[PDB]
Each structure stands twice: as structure tokens, then as C-alpha cells.
Amino acid sequence: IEDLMFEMSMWRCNDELRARADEVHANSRKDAAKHYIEFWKSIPTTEPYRVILGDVRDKLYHTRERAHQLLSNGHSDVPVEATFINLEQFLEPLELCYRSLCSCGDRPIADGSLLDFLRQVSTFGLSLVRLDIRQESDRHTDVLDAITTHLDIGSYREWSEERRQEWLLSELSGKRPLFGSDLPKTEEIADVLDTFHVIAELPADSFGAYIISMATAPSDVLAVELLQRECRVKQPLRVVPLFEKLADLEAAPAAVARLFSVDWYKNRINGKQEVMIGYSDSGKDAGRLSAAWQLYKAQEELVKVAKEYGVKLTMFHGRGGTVGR
Amino acid sequence: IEDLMFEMSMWRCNDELRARADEVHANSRKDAAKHYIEFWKSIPTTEPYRVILGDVRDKLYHTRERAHQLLSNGHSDVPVEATFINLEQFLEPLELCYRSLCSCGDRPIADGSLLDFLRQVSTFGLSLVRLDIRQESDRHTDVLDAITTHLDIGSYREWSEERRQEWLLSELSGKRPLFGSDLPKTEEIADVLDTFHVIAELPADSFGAYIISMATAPSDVLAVELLQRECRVKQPLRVVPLFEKLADLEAAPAAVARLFSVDWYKNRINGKQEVMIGYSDSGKDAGRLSAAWQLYKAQEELVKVAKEYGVKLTMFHGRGGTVGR
């Protein structure tokens, strides 16, 4: 940030950036701010891009500091308002700079360090990569079965796939808390639950997708959606099934089709769905040839299903480094 | 406590209290403790009663300081283990002192300042008086109706008393959280809920009874029991109805009998029940004479019901100072 501030020493800007620059200089905090190396003194409005980038620095410093304490200890006194919480509370000021520079015939300058910085922010965001969370179906099933058994309402394990779909739906559309503090938990049960609580506790742009291994039916996806909502995950992440064994690839288009059939879920999906395709285990229980060919057929029929339901499918290829995977 | 410690200067004790005093002098903490006025130095085993009472002092001091900060600010850094949490973690050491004194032929000594102090503890406890909480039934009814409306299941108001009893019972025996964080609340609704949370947050031995004004049916009491349980009131307090209007007194024995009929509630009440009898409003809408006579009849018939259901009744007389009330 400090080099960027150094280069952005223009004095011409548009009326928008001038207005905002005056805003920041109004609350510029006329203070020493001696901890900084460069630009330690209050930034004059003579250099407005530097005013704005300077506020970006104070927020970037405080973000790094909140994270550093949160990591070192169990808590931080840094107020979240002093930090970037949004993927683009960061991006807005940089865009304003870009527009202003272009307005004044300084487009080459904007396509210099500022552009590199824009692309870096829009590509890495507040946490370098988005993290995927993966877990096998049977663990979610164990959690739910503990929940229905504790509610003296049956056994989610023993239930037919239809019974599971219907129950999961009714609870998803409902407004009442499911389990409470007193739910009897295996260490595993609490493991999956606690990963959900952890996901809720953290920022959304820090996670990617929830991948379900050994996924067979829509109940498998609806189960994760329900567990997320119930674990007070404010912005739940996308659920995506994994088909890796040859049989699961053969069965994938049907299972995805059955899922998209459920109108409640296809309506909430916002027209986008991701599904993962494992390459490793297919050529291990059947031929390498037959695996590859079934993979091709599966990709083909899945895209057909998605087109049929007007959903843009993106396929996540669990390819390895070796041809055998 | 310091005056009492000064007096408890005996050197004879039984083997029980000797063992205990040796316990405290083991963790006596060879420390200055300069804030204290008297007995600021570590207490010798020559005077064992002073040792036990000395720990009683340290826990008493930390209690006053914890409450003092809790009141002055919003919090205290005092650890709860360093305070008296039980009505009688206080009493136990004093009892031990009394036993020791009697063992050694010092019953006259025991019946002096030590006795006065025992009676004071056992009578005022950690918070001078147990506080009663009173509220009218219709506020509980408003909260519940808000809950059933939010759960899309009907209107508790419009429900027959039978329906009310049935639902309340099913939820009291049930194990699922009722409302969640997202329950729409009036200022009133949040008033009653928040007083329940406040009861839950504080120690149990600080409260007495929940008194329900204008109580007419059992649903009025079951509402309070459920609202307590659902507001995670760890040790819910006893519910007690108020019959103040002349009609409510005529109908009171019937309504109390109906309440005792409920097998669950008679099971929870554990053979003790309190009911309040108002004197103020009775002689205001009808004659004073008719008020008194219906009051006598009421006491009589209530005792009849309690005897019939094998429950020890205590009657709470809402008398005034003037004969007119």
C-alpha cells in the first residue's frame, strides 16, 4: 500500500473523488500516527488519491492487526469497523481511484500499479484462497439420526429416502430451532457440528464450497443445507456432491436430476449448481478405459440434465497428476 | 466476621474441625493480605476456629467485591469459585464450628455470637430477602399467542382452555427449543421474556415466587412454568396464583383443583404449593362483609383441595394496613 500511495501523487481528480477525499480528510484524525514508516503525517487534500489510499492503509493495518491477535490469542480488541469485512469494502476506493484517473486523461497511470492492485484484490480477496469443507454423507446422517432419536420422532437412518427428503424439507421451510444445547453427541457428531459453528463464526468470503463424499440422493444435499441453517450460518455455502466410484458416476445424472426436481431447492439454488467428479477410484475398481469413458458419458448426461432444468452447471474435476488418476 | 473471628479464639476442637483447619492452613497462602484490617497475617493453627472463619472471611470479602464491581460497572474479574455460591457453603463451616464447640463442652460459647451469626446466615442468606416477581396472566398469554402465531399453528388467545392445557403440556414434556432468536417481540413481549432471562442469569437463592395476577385457569400457571423452562431458568421458581376479584375467589378452589388434576404438574410441585389471596379488591366491588365471609370460605375450601390431593398448601394473604383492605 505504501508504494501505491507514493505513485498516486496526481493533483487532478474528478468531483466524486474530490468529495470523498474531503470526507476522509474531515475525519483524518489530526494525529501523529508515528508507528507508520511512510506517510506518517496527516495526508493533505492537495493529494486526494493519497488521502483515499491512506484511509485504505489504516483499514489494512487494522485488519492485519485484528487477524494477528485473533490468531496469537483467543480474541482481539480491534473493532471490526476498522477492518475490511467485505471482499470489496476494499475494492470500492480503488475503483473510485481508477474512474477518477480515467476521467482526467490518466488512464495509463491507472493501468499501472493501481490496476495490478485491483486485479490482486479481486482475485485473492481478504483471505488468499477460498477454503472448501468436505465430509462423507454418513457423518451428516449420523448427526441427523442423533437429532431425530433425541426428539423421539424416529430414526433418520432407518427412514426411506422419500421420508428423509420430506422431513428435511419441512424442517428447512420451518422457523423453529431443531436441536438444542442438550443434544447427546458423539465426538464425531460434535465434530461436524463444530465445523459448522466455526464456519458461522468466520467471514463468508473465507470459505468456498461444502463437498459431500459418497453422495447418492437429494436427501444428502438437503441434509447439509439444514445443518448449516440450523448452525446459524448466516451466509450458507453451496453444497456439491462427489461422485467418484464408477457406480456413482453411472448414477450421477439421475441423482442430480432428482435433486433439481425438488422445486424448493432448485428455486433457492439461484440458477447455479456445482458437482464434483472424482477420477481416482473409477479406474481402480473397473478398467482405466471403462472409467474414462463412463466419466465422459457422465459429464455429458449431467450437462444435459442441467440444461433441461435451466441451471448453469459447473463441474469440479478431481483429476490427479498421474493418468491412472 | 472480624469480631466473630476475634472471639473464636479457643484451642480445643474435635478431630473433625482439626482436620478441616489443617486443610485451610495447607493452602493458607503465606501472603501479606495487607488490605485487611484485622487478622491480616496468616492464621496459626493454635486458633483453629479462626482459621476456618478466616477462609469464611476471604470468601465473604471476594463476594462483596464481586457484587460491588458487578454493580458499579457491568462486570467483575472476581472468580465465582472465590465467592460463596451456595446458600450454605457459607453455613457448613459455621455448623462445623458449632459441632466442635459442643463436642468440647463449649455449648454456652456456641450459643453466643456464633449462634446469632448462624441464625443470621440461615435467615437472610446471600441476598437479604428473596424477591417475588409478579405479572398478570394476559401478558403471558400475549407472549404465547405471539409464539403460536409465529409458529403458524394458531392463536393461543382464541384457543379453548382445554386446547391451551394440551399444548402447554406437550411442550413442557417436550425437548425441542420453542421460539428462536428470530421471534417477533413487542416491547411488552420482550419485557416478560427479558425478565425471565434476567431471572435465569442470576443466582436462584435471590428469588422467591412468581405471582400471577388475575389467574383463572391452570393454563395461566403452566404458561409460566413453560416460559421459565424455555428461557433456560436453571432452577425454575415456584408458580403461585393471585385470586383478588370476588368472582376469582368464588371460583378459586375449583381452579386450583383443576390445576392439581394435571398429573405432570402435581408431579413437579413435589407436594408443596403456594397460592395468594387478595384482600384489597374484594371489598371494593362488593360489600366488605361479603368479602370477609367469602375469604373465610375460600381459605377453607382451598385447604380442602390441598388435603384431597396430598399437597402441603401455604396461603399467601394479601392484607393491607387498613381494615378496608
Side-chain angles (χ1 to χ4, degrees), chain A residues 150 171 176-178 182, chain B residues 171 175-178 180 182:
Chain A
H150 168 65
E171 288 296 332
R176 183 169 189 176
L178 196 61
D182 52 303
Chain B
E171 288 297 333
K175 221 77 64 60
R176 182 165 190 172
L178 199 61
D182 51 304

Side-chain angles (χ1 to χ4, degrees), chain B residues 40-76:
Chain B
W40 83 335
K41 44 206 303 179
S42 176
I43 308 190
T45 170
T46 310
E47 30 218 50
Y49 301 98
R50 284 181 178 178
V51 167
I52 290 189
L53 289 181
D55 174 67
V56 176
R57 180 193 58 183
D58 308 347
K59 290 184 187 177
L60 230 50
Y61 170 75
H62 288 313
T63 291
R64 193 249 289 145
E65 210 60 31
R66 172 114 192 284
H68 176 291
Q69 303 166 2
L70 239 48
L71 244 171
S72 175
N73 323 327
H75 52 9
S76 180

